[PDB]
Structure 1
């Protein structure tokens, strides 16, 4: 079924929290990218690290939940590709500092499965929270 249907189902599963069910939406192999410097992968902001498979995606959603709300402004869809436009308004577990990060979430869907997850977000604001 559709690219847009797949994405809306992803947003609702993400809003609902269960990481295993979130990962169920993801392809076995996943292209995972983040607008964070190479050298700061697995740095002070802990989820920032490279990922490659569904199980990796699962561990990611378990980890943002360990270390808060989110608004979705729009969802642009153009074929197999989509961009979720919103804002993260969370608070960093360790430092206690509350932060807001605008994000654009780029997704690709093939056969109802997410094959790409590329986050573009205010990396410096998140970083200063940690």
Structure 2
């Protein structure tokens, strides 16, 4: 068995490296995936904001979010990683540049993860959706 913290550290490494197939390898086949965003299509400006429940869906998310950002001006700064049993919360800030508009933005985020059998089963993002939306609108 691998600790929750080690599993979370590996996920954060793979997310920062960016490859969607390699990130999704860390998720269970079925994933509880939630984003602190309203439902709908948001006039098309944030296409990765959709409902997901599968490893294949997770791979699609990380593909889309990469395609919509300038890779060399985008990153997530992690301030702390809290771990309690099988759960963890990653606290940080998105420092990204939106591809279509060129606007840089900062968005605080908390990422709540659950791990079982070394795989991520839950990935719930709480982030400044207003700031992200404004950067792409």
Classify the TM-score, shorter chain. over 0.9
TM-score (norm 2): 0.90
**Can you give the 5+ residue segments of structure 2 that lack an aligned partner in the other structure?**
70-74
CA deviations on 1:68-103 (whole Å, 9 max, x unpaired) are 721000000001110000000111111111111000
Q: 1:49 to 1:41 in 2, by over 3 A?
A: farther
Report how many aligned residue pairs link the two structures: 130
8 Å contact kept, 1:41–1:49: no
RMSD: 1.4
CA deviations on 1:4-57 (whole Å, 9 max, x unpaired) are 110000011111111111100000000000000123468421111001100100
Q: 1:3 to 1:28 in 2, by over 3 A?
A: same
Q: After the TM superposition, which parts of structure 1 deviate over 6 Å for at least 4 consecutive aligned residues?
A: none
8 Å contact kept, 2:88–2:114: yes
8 Å contact kept, 1:87–1:101: yes
**Can you give the 5+ residue segments of structure 1 that lack an aligned partner in the other structure?**
none
In the TM superposition, residue 125 of structure 1 has moved relative to its aligned partner by: 0.2
